[PDB]
């Protein structure tokens, strides 16, 4: 087999929301330590989202991994069931 | 008004819960079970699928969380797999306390051990002053215990001699 | 830290405690896409 590189790139992504102030670190986990977070957005007209940008302070092992995901918000402004993209990311 | 949620994996047939209670009113003073579903954003609705009245007679109570009142209702209550539901408890009464279970805190009988996971992992306690909106308690859980059923072939009741 | 926005906390992923005060540190890319796309391989 060969490898390959993509030259003329299908789209062009731009940031359109960021932010970038940050003060403390949250457990993904806060409840079960012994002894999962979610973040809202929208915007205002209709548009392509390509890929996220997250910043983590301490991860795991190699085995271990995170599961992320983009859920719908419901009428009364809290997270539904509902799961419109789904993803793992390995610990490297 | 305090709330409990709860789900199975299956379809299951719930005859009976299991409810503990540190304190009671007067004789006269009655509590009202029921169980309502889950809404969509994880929180009870107003739907009620079961409801009962439970008086002070039978509520028992335990200064160490040991007597376990069996609550009844008259039509089962069948529980969908996969679908969230949630115990609720009712009454006027300022006099009424249940045991709950929090992380972190020593256990009753055992205050060497301390609860280090979460009681319940996939259920949350909840608190409200009108039934209709709940405060959530990620950390605590109550200390209940669900009872579930399966018919068999046939039945017999034998009446005392006449 | 981001106004139309609340940060969000689970123990179950079902019932969520928000943070009115706090947001994650995030960012979102959108996409426009391109006429033609291209890819080249090693040489043989």
Avoid: C
């Amino acid at each position: 087999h060969i490898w390959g590189r993509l030259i003329s790139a299908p789209f062009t992504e731009e940031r359109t929301i960021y932010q970038g102030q940050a003060s403390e670190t949250l457990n993904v986990n806060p409840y079960n330590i012994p002894n999962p977070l979610a973040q809202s957005f929208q915007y205002d007209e209709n548009r392509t989202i390509s890929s996220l940008g997250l910043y983590f302070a301490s991860k795991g092992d190699k085995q271990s991994n995170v599961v992320i995901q983009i859920r719908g918000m419901g009428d009364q402004g809290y997270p539904n069931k509902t799961i419109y993209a789904e993803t793992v990311m390995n610990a490297d | 008004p305090l709330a409990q949620s709860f789900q199975y994996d299956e379809n299951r047939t719930i005859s009976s819960l299991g409810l503990y209670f540190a304190s009671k009113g007067d004789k006269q003073s009655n509590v009202v079970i029921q169980i309502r579903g889950m809404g969509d954003q994880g929180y009870p609705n107003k739907t009620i699928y079961a409801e009962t009245v439970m008086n002070a007679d039978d509520i028992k109570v335990s200064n160490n969380a040991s007597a376990e009142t069996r609550v009844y209702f008259d039509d089962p209550m069948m529980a969908e797999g996969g679908k969230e539901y949630a115990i609720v408890i009712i009454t006027e009464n300022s006099d009424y306390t249940m045991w709950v279970g929090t992380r972190t805190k020593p256990k009753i009988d055992k205050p060497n051990e301390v609860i280090s996971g979460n009681p319940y992992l996939q259920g949350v306690l909840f608190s409200s002053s009108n039934a209709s909106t709940w405060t959530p308690h990620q950390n605590s859980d109550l200390k209940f215990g669900i009872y579930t059923s399966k018919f068999n072939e046939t039945a017999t009741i034998e009446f005392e001699p006449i």
